[PDB]
């Protein structure tokens, strides 16, 4: 198409740090999942923190989420937001968990990905039959569960669909949250999501996560 | 860093940040049966990643009063996913194991577990006379058995609860002759045993014979001052390794 | 690729990087 | 060879994705599953490190998530409205014979939110015009429109047949009924090396000084008139301006807008309503 | 050499047919006329085996029975209807200023039956739009339409001038009166490697779970509006969507539909009528 | 040892014995402007060691009630030694930065800060309408701003205090897309960000435009049992890097 | 004609058994003739069977 | 055969097989 400014020379392109060439570079950055998302927490930083504490009963559940990247609570993460500009997704997801207790606190967690066809696991015993990590909390404060791409079709819809749904993450006490004296008997964990090396988005669309009136 | 481990088995991964190495029982890594040692002529099924993965057993609470715990293999896994199904549908099986025992605490807790894998752990009765331990008692599944001090019951088929006699008329101080590690709460939060298949026959009935017994005994009791967590879980995760099965048939029903 | 107009800006979408 | 890049471009296979390598059970002091997110780096762990993978030849491509693909689509940026008059005096007036629009990407949320994923952007702009002249009487008459780009400091029209419409130096494009949608390119036209999507700065030191991206580059005004003099039957004319970025560069990625826009060139988000506060798309459970 | 394939393509001689060889009387233990259809194989017997044939140089070609020839013709797949209003409130509403249509090949029997000769199909789709705006008053006004493809999960328009029509990421095509028929390609867009014409499966395990090809891939929605605001004289607008498959592959041939279609994505065939049962095209004698 | 850092800048040295590496924002180390990208033709002054040194800002107290803090650059350094004087005497400047955020505690404290550097952190108003944030509010100097929950004031020029919306209508959980580290009290006692000059022009007015905003937000609140120190300081030290100035004139006066 | 999806990469074509390239491949397969086609038989498998008897 | 558009899908009918 013809230029409206027929001899115009644009201003020199200077080097600027942080050039982005592809949105998957942004999906490959961890962003916090608002896992807690109760009515008391969604106006606050508290939605990003999952509570851990010394249990009286063994093998209790800590949290659960659907893994489908543009479903709630993943939807407002950077990967969920970018995925909601696209109709299809594929490839593996990395969920990372950062323990924020004291250095004197100890914990093991079983974090499990359960594929479609059985709903959410009702116990750690059901959950551990799926893909899982036993995470020992230590000097390294962060662990990652990879949700491998395990699907019938090469792609899934980003919009919720019972044919295309990706399954669930569940987190369980392996052992317990154990502390000595003079240590809080409770702590927070922060949950994060990012794309693995195989992750892709396909058919561009208007997002369902932003609207305009007037 | 020698403190760290990650073990990946099928779709399952275990981590620890305070190990004390791992023990390969008798220095032999698990492997599939070779044609030289085989006798059953049917081609075995090797279910691979769906079977050779960690299953986490029911967790137990270590208290200042605890006397010990045990599990039998393959019995502890008989209800566990595709490994458990293969045990029930086949006349014969063989497997090695990775056993990972998990018990975190603080810098302020004290205690010592021995964690031992015993081949052919033939149990003594808790009663006088020649009456042997009953099948249902040596087949507790993923719950295992919890040892209780001075336990009272009328059932003459029940096993010995004398952890100091290895439940079998031999002294606990000699239990280290078996493949073992310790969990010493000041040192480590886990123990790892890699067990080859050990038997006088190349494959065996999974439901009739427990090749290995996992024995966990507190030698130094759990101690921790007020305000510290007074009881701590022990959690056992076990992965079959190089599991094989042969002689497919109808499912066994008890 | 043929360019019909005298300005670089007049060309269609750029090659991917 | 350039023919390989052409074949990859027509197949949309320019941006290849790694294969999944086969992996096996591992027992090691190396623990890829463990890291320190405190470092600000995302863990490098991949599926092969944490499950036993098969070999998969990965057919996926990233071409459609390129910034050229993502921002290089035509979206509406303005609706410019005027209602013609049969009265010779009223037909000369703004809102009746002609309308003006201060150029920005700020008024339409769908485009605005996409470009605001970046702090700085540089692109040439393809403009396409969709005119719809709603007949209010029994006939359309002869509809000829002039769209004139008025750069900053050039005189803006005050009347439908003002001297400024002579367009002796400004770019104008003419459209008549039945003509295809007008299209032209505006080259990247900032006085800076990129457009500021955001600007944490001011035009001055004072309480009255302007704040934000409005300071950084005035983008001029589109002026549209009906060229036709007053006619018997009125028309409610709406010109929709569509913008496609081309030759795109983008820098310093940002969190997406999480709450409704309130004003142009402003990150302000607090609504006027006293019962309803600012709303996010995080659903409670 | 590619010029030979070009010459064969312009002559429609790509798919040559065997010559009839000359044959003579035979008296043999070989009996080509006899076989076992129980095998599930069709007999290999040819004319030369069962009559005395002459030599015939066979001029016939199979090019027009190629799947590209058979499915690669434009057929109607939707009629999208809306009736514009002079009332500013009513012209904003669905069925009046705009209409939506859930994309499928299921609504028009001529196309549906042809593609349903196969279990799986893979093709790119050429879409062509035929708009006919029936004037209900003394003038057409200015007719400008926008067709927007809304992929699954993108927000569907609820009003004629809703924010969704900005089309910042969706594909839109604009049409105005006197413009040639709009045309664009949709590439093969399933999440699977082919479209399911049939699917013996469910979206779930339950009594309420959906069954059949509707489960397999949601195809999004075509939204059409008149872009023009309310006008004096109403129009009964019908947009006909024509579809041609291209680059076609087809698998697992099926018996053709032998009885009327009753519903979209369903093999159901029992009519509502209590006197008339389902009708075939087998004539009695 | 990967835990240790020493950074020496001019006559200033900073140490930490519990780092979590350092982040170079966008992978680009700071440097002087090259002739290819320059537009202002006057020879710049490069004050080197007297300017490119750590200045420690006013320290802030992290309590269980804290909501966050922020500073603007170069504004936070406008009163800081020769760097500050050069900002006031020159029309144009450019600099990179080393930001070192310091927050020690015990093995018994809990808490998580995100420490992020945001380019062009254009703030939202705390009030409805189109009224933009006032100059004096985005120029707090070395004190920075402390965020207060449910803050009451009549001044419609004040910035948003919604740290959960990044003070700008975007979610806090996505703040990690900016150059950032965390201070997790169990892991590390400091965060280090190395920031190149980031702008759409090669140099800019130091007093009219803040290129970077340093945002510190507690995501997991400070927790510590009785007898432990109940509030802990956060201290920010910032060194200009490759600072340059041009267009010398009379000193600006506000 | 222009693509409405300008960078879209279609899902990999996997091998599927039973590809049909020409309708004459389908015409070359035997199918049953409803030879009997009397009013009593056209709602039934019986239309495909011709009666033989002594 | 000249292809005017940047996508393989934009081409006319495929060659016969
Ligand atoms: C004169 C035709 C319209 C030109 C549109 C220019 C779009 C780029 C403007 C960038 C600044 C902004 O508004 O945020
Ligand atoms: C968006 C323009 C219309 C696209 C038409 C797609 C036709 C193929 C659909 C195949 C599935 C089916 O409906 O049976």
Residue numbers in the entry:
A (entry chain C): 21 to 234
B (entry chain B), F (entry chain B): 10 to 263
C (entry chain D), H (entry chain D): 28 to 44
D (entry chain A), E (entry chain A): 4 to 288
G (entry chain C): 21 to 74
List sentences from the manuscript:
Rhinoviruses (RVs) are the main cause of the common cold. Belonging to the large family Picornaviridae, the typical architecture of RVs comprises a ~ 30 nm diameter capsid enclosing a ss(+) RNA genome of about 7200 bases. The building blocks are four capsid proteins (VPs) present as 60 copies each and arranged on a pseudo T = 3 lattice. After the first 3Dstructures of RV-B146 as well as of the closely related poliovirus type 17 had been solved, high-resolution X-ray and cryo-electron microscopy (cryo-EM) structures of numerous RV types and of closely related members of the Enterovirus genus became available and have been used for the design of capsid-binding compounds. These drug candidates attach inside a hydrophobic pocket mainly contributed by amino acid residues of VP1 and displace a natural pocket factor—in most cases a myristate—stabilizing the viral shell against structural changes required for release of the viral RNA genome into the host cell’s cytosol for infection.
Following up on these results we determined the cryo-EM structure of the same RV-A89 in plain buffer lacking OBR-5-340 and DMSO and found that the hydrophobic pocket was filled with myristate. Using the remaining 80% of the particles we solved the structure of the native RV-A89 to a near atomic resolution of 1.76 Å, locally ranging between 1.55 Å and 1.85 Å. Thorough analysis of the hydrophobic pocket revealed an isolated density with elongated shape, which cannot be assigned to a protein chain; it is at the assumed position of a myristate and has its typical shape. Although the full density of the fatty acid appears better visible in a low pass filtered (2.5 Å) map, the density is sharp enough to determine the correct position and orientation of the molecule. The fact that the myristate could not be clearly seen at higher resolution suggests either partial occupancy across the icosahedral virion (i.e. less than the 60 positions would be occupied) and/or loose binding to the hydrophobic pocket. The latter would explain why DMSO readily elutes myristate from its binding site, or why antiviral drug candidates can easily displace the myristate for many rhinovirus types and antivirals. To understand the implication of the missing myristate on the viral conformation, we analyzed the differences of the two atomic models, derived from cryo-EM maps reconstructed from data acquired in the presence or absence of DMSO. However, focused r.m.s.d. analysis of residues forming the hydrophobic pocket revealed a significant conformational change of a five amino acid stretch at the end of the G-H loop corresponding to VP1 residues 218–223 with local average r.m.s.d.Ø of 3.692 Å.
